Amino acid sequence: NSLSAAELTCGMIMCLARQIPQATASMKDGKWERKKFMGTELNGKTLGILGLGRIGREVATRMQSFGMKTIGYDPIISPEVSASFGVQQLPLEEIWPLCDFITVHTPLLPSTTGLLNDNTFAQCKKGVRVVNCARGGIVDEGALLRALQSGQCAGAALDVFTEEPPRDRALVDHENVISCPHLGASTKEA
Numbered sequence: 001n002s003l004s005a006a007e008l009t010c011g012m013i014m015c016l017a018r019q020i021p022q023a024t025a026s027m028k029d030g031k032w033e034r035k036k037f038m039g040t041e042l043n044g045k046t047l048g049i050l051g052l053g054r055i056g057r058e059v060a061t062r063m064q065s066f067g068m069k070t071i072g073y074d075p076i077i078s079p080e081v082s083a084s085f086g087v088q089q090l091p092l093e094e095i096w097p098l099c100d101f102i103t104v105h106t107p108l109l110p111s112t113t114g115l116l117n118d119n120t121f122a123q124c125k126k127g128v129r130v131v132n133c134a135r136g137g138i139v140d141e142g143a144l145l146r147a148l149q150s151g152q153c154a155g156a157a158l159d160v161f162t163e164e165p166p167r168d169r170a171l172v173d174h175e176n177v178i179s180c181p182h183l184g185a186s187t188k189e190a
């Protein structure tokens, strides 16, 4: 249930940091491009977790074992509660500039549609990497594409889309985007 989505989320973080999907595609194309796929060490990097329910918490404790600094926001949870599972809660506007990675684990609500958009992408560190394994639309897909084309977002991992399967292929086809056909709950155990 929740663990299958959390596990996919953590797998997406790893794939963004080390470009494994892109590296595998390169190898199967007969190339050996070690320089192109220089990646990111996760230890010491900051992961922003938006939404601190069950799945957000599971992602947090897994990624803490990699030495990631886990910060986040959830308007239902108090900072004292989030501290108990190791997530430093800050106001959203303080979160954007600090994150190397951002992952969303909110319900899809009016307040969370387009949570990442043109405004908040601009508040991020240049080169932020974004994961959406929750619900399509939490990350504004048009804004995400603009951030990818500018370099403001260095990479994105999407398990979900506003339309499934997506009809607009701009995100899926982007070289810095990794994607899955909504596999979040696709394990035999789940």
Ligand SMILES: CC(=O)c1cccc(NS(=O)(=O)c2ccc(C(=O)Nc3nc(-c4cccc(F)c4)cs3)cc2)c1
Pocket: 049, 050, 051, 052, 053, 054, 073, 074, 075, 076, 077, 081, 106, 107, 109, 111, 112, 115
């Ligand atoms: C563990 C504990 O003692 C405790 C204490 C109180 C309640 C619970 N219950 S819970 O843990 O199951 C749970 C359930 C729901 C939610 C939740 O609805 N979160 C949402 N976030 C946004 C959100 C909007 C904008 C930006 C953004 F980043 C996030 C919208 S709604 C969060 C946690 C548990």
